[PDB]
Symmetry: C3
Subunit: 480 residues, 3 copies
């Protein structure tokens, strides 16, 4: 009569790699690399996007007449700019610090548009429009020009009596010629000034031809500022100035999440949003995109990070089948557990799982997986940024951060999986060996350690004796 200690072999096709071996068959494995997304742009935990289908961010900021105003309590956590959004500034010119302005507007926790300089309080003409601007003009500024061939110096003030800062906008106009300068502002040499308690800026007139844009040869330089609570904004000009009209109240701003994308919008909530799609993921790594916002696994460019869970899955080589245990390989027949017993006595042969050692092993492998997954922080995000033509150095520095961080995570995740897989396979060997040593102690000198998982019993052992050996109540000292 014999009793043998073995472990499960299964129909699984899974293989993994380890630090020391390639393509080892295993009975169970777990992917650590999240690989799927829902092909949509969704809400995150921080909020919902603002989709812009015909207007650029700065079109909304300055109030391009082809753009809708924003709803008076809207919030958004990121901005989507479709390839059809082409309405930015409409009158030919340039925006100062456009990248910083777009970042500033890229998020809001509760939007409000506030009037700052009522258009009827100006003493000159304030109604001018332009064909470049849909035969209208901007909705957040007013173009001042001469009235009755005169342009006395205008001066007006506004105090921020709100609880949050206000983003405000203005521009300086440079006509295409001296006659255009006279026609619009009468005075040939003008001075415009913007000031607060924190800043003072002076602008002097100029005119002359420029490269024609849709027929127009004058130019505007667009500027912007932030008026903090209780500060006062003074506007002064005797020509060439497009003055503020309405400001935007800034609440929860400058998160920077801007996405130029054609991916369809959806009605969905997601932990992690990328340009090509969003997803929920408990895994610590992902191969979907280097840029993502929300609560995001670290990005790793590779196809798989497969962790071994179960054991080496090579059965004992069938060639009648002799009798052996764990030393020769696994048992294709073992069912209810990872490790178990096969016995041979005069009532026949049988095979039963050992639930204790199996559950101990499962708890250990489960806490290993949970530690590898749970220790990963998911607070910070890596997002795409915009840089101007004279910002290639900071562009390179930004990319260097993203790339060096990626190299660290790729190497550490690959090596961690390889090292842990080696350990896990060795741990299963240790577990089944420890089951075998327990029985050895329990059987004492009543059995010869063939040792190949198998024990030759020096006395007959029927099914009841076999059960006592399995459930650990067999006494090696018994007399019957």
């Amino acid at each position: 009569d014999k009793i043998c200690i073995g472990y499960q072999s299964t129909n699984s096709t899974d293989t993994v790699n380890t630090l020391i071996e390639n393509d080892v068959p295993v009975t169970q494995s777990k992917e650590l690399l999240h690989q799927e997304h829902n092909g949509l742009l969704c809400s995150t935990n921080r909020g919902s996007p603002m989709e812009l289908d015909k207007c650029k961010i700065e079109g909304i900021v300055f109030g391009n007449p082809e753009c809708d105003l924003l709803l008076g309590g809207r919030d958004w956590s990121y901005i989507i700019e479709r390839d059809t959004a082409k309405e930015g500034i409409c009158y030919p010119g340039s925006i100062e610090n456009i990248e910083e302005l777009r970042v500033l507007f890229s998020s809001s926790s509760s939007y409000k548009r506030i009037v700052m300089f009522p258009d009827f309080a100006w003493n000159v003409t304030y109604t001018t429009t332009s064909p470049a601007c849909s035969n209208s003009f901007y909705r957040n500024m007013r173009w001042l020009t001469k009235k009755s061939d005169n342009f006395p110096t205008q001066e007006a003030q506004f105090k921020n009596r709100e609880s949050d800062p206000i983003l405000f906008m203005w521009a300086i106009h440079y006509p295409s010629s001296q006659s255009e300068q006279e026609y619009l502002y009468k005075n040939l040499d003008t001075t415009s000034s913007v000031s607060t308690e924190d800043l003072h800026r002076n602008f002097k007139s100029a005119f002359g031809s420029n490269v024609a844009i849709k027929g127009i040869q004058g130019r505007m330089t667009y500027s912007w500022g932030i008026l903090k609570p209780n500060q006062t904004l003074k506007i002064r000009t005797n020509g060439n100035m497009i003055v503020p009209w309405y400001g935007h109240i800034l609440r929860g701003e400058s998160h920077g999440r801007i996405l130029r994308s054609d991916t369809p919008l959806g009605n969905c909530l997601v932990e992690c949003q990328t340009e090509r799609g969003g997803f929920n993921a408990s895994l610590p790594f992902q191969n979907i995109s280097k840029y993502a916002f929300g609560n995001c696994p670290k990005y790793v460019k590779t196809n798989s990070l497969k962790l071994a869970l179960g054991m080496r899955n090579v059965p004992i080589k069938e060639t009648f089948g002799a009798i052996a245990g764990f030393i020769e390989g696994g048992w294709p027949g073992l069912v209810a557990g990872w490790y178990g017993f096969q016995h041979y006595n005069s009532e026949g042969t049988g095979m039963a799982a050992d639930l204790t050692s199996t559950q101990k092993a499962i708890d250990k492998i489960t806490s290993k997986v949970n530690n590898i997954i749970d220790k990963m922080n998911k607070q910070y995000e890596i997002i795409g940024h915009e840089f101007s033509e004279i910002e290639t150095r900071i562009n390179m520095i930004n990319d260097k951060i993203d790339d060096q961080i990626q190299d660290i995570w790729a190497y550490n995740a690959e090596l961690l999986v390889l090292l842990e897989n080696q350990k896990t396979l060795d741990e299963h060997d240790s577990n089944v060996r420890n089951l075998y040593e327990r029985v050895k102690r329990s059987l004492g000198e009543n059995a010869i350690d063939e040792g190949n998982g198998c024990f030759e019993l020096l006395h007959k052992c029927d099914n009841t004796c076999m059960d006592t050996i399995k459930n650990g109540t067999y006494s090696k000292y018994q007399y019957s």
Copy 2:
């Protein structure tokens, strides 16, 4: 007669976590996370701080009259700005590149103030003061205004004949009105120029009202520069210029350490200084602050990084107490060592530590701890930086570096402690098993391996024979 191999069990309450198990009792452990600070702002190895109680950095730079001059050989390695330090620039205006200027002044290895343009060599009035500036004016510049209703062009030069570069300061004044412009400089349109071999800057006059600051409606724009050794600075103006007077000699500058803090100053030396307090630490990690200067462990936000040193601390379950060794658990009675022997013979029972295997194990655990601690570099620091309103992109990029580095260290330190704890417990099991196998070999066929740490001796073994077994001189071949 029996001899048994076991290991220590103690009254310790320590637990640790391992990759595969939670809250394992251990007999000894070591914190890797430094958690204490002295609640004070101290000196570091680089030097001592400069505490500023009423003046801002730029107040000292331009020489606000409410500020003391600096001592002529002072050094400092960082700057402390208390919440009462409100004297920066006193005449209403703006400093160009203020963040860069404050960084430049944030450290000095040996300070000196040097005169560059003696105030009496100007041919116009150079004495003007202002109520905004304590009815005085700046101590490092001079306000030039008309003399006898006249302002001929002034022009003067200064060569840096020192061995180090000089920081110098100037400003341009924009009066509140045309009449103020005439009253101060006579000429309505003025030109001011600053030049060196490396730079040339031109400034034209302007005037007009601004938002009133403490009643004043004119404004100044403050500027600064660095004159390198042997270079020459030429100053030219016919109005609107506040000219340099004294410069600061720059030695060991631009370290960037600036602290806005109410933490009390102390008379202490420290390796690592944070806003809330400093500390000495041999440990590689710390949870005190993300920003610190000096020689600093890496920052990890968590409560504990507990490394196991001793062994699993579960004693053999008392239930008379039978006889077993290391296979069943630890011995609460073992005292002078980690591993040892318990013997049973006709003269009685006894328990003695094995010093050899204990010292080998101690050396291994000690070198593991020292490698984990000593390989950590402590040269570089992560410090808080100041950014302007149009610098949110580089602000975000800077924060991304700090945050991604933190995520790497947190994950690697947590996992390293978990992996090493697993290994250390297994290593203690291996050590005591190896002691047991040595005795087994030495006893040879004179003993039955009960194997549970215990050996049943096939011959009587008195205290002297027991001692020979312990100190390895027992011969399994002996005839007596």
Copy 3:
């Protein structure tokens, strides 16, 4: 008769460190830290350098007359500036955004110089030269001055009809005095304008003295721009402007690789190029330089990263020599393999390697080394950057990235080598123990496990029986 299981001991002097032990002798080891370079500046996989022996980058950009023009199909992947390259701009002044300009020119995949404003199409004088510029003038711009005591407004246009963007250059001149202003441009107050569809820039005249540079007291401010395909550049001026003449066609630009170095140029191809020399390397780490371009191992400042390959190299202590195996140490005589047998019978004694277990062990150690080496990514580079005097914050941030990344790699590489060395030595112990257990099973009860690698055979075993034991065909059940 006896048969013993042992492992190789050799004449090797190699030691390594492990997490738990110092200066362990080993029979074979491998450096992971690349330490050699060829003392030359070479080509990389991206291309060959441009060596500049007398001209600075910006000398080539603006066309300093002492510089050769570039060949019309030249490419370069980085720039070398020798300490003799002193010809940058020749007429005294300053370049706007000089760091960004030098980065932009630092690489090209196929160069071309293109004429944009033929010098003979100007209606004023366009030929002026200066002693500061070798009694010539720049080759890529033209100095416009008055003709017949007159300077009517010039205006000209150029469209980019190429497939790539064009870098173009211009400057504004500020004479040393009003009489110089009249002599050069007649008009006392001039206006110059540069414009494209994307930009408009206006420049007004000024004059006055400056610090004299090689006798000259006027100054130039140099500017530059990028005209994209199909855009139009309009140039307008009535004085003080140095106008574009030739532009540079930008193909594969802004890689940033600039090297100020005296290292000799060579005719060599290299994976990784540093300032002091280049090298090919399969290893994942290098200690040659923190800055390098190409495909580069991570930089680690330390002398050695020695990985153990073979086994603990302590032979059994010779003291006649008794009989033992792997438990006591290694065999200085074992030759053809790592693990083997020593036998003792009536025909004599012998020693033979076991090729199976040796090859299995070699495959495992080899895949460990290859995984540690091959998982390292070598796409990204860390290079030195240039920063201006008001860019110390981004300078510090850049250095922080480089330094924090270095701290991570140094700690992880040191600890990885220590941990793997511990494991590798333990793995060799396991391998030889597993060989010993195989023979034990094969010999069954025909041998007493002395266990010290040695088996005492309970029957005579001649050379043929010994060979059957070695090649695994010995039957413990045999009857002869």
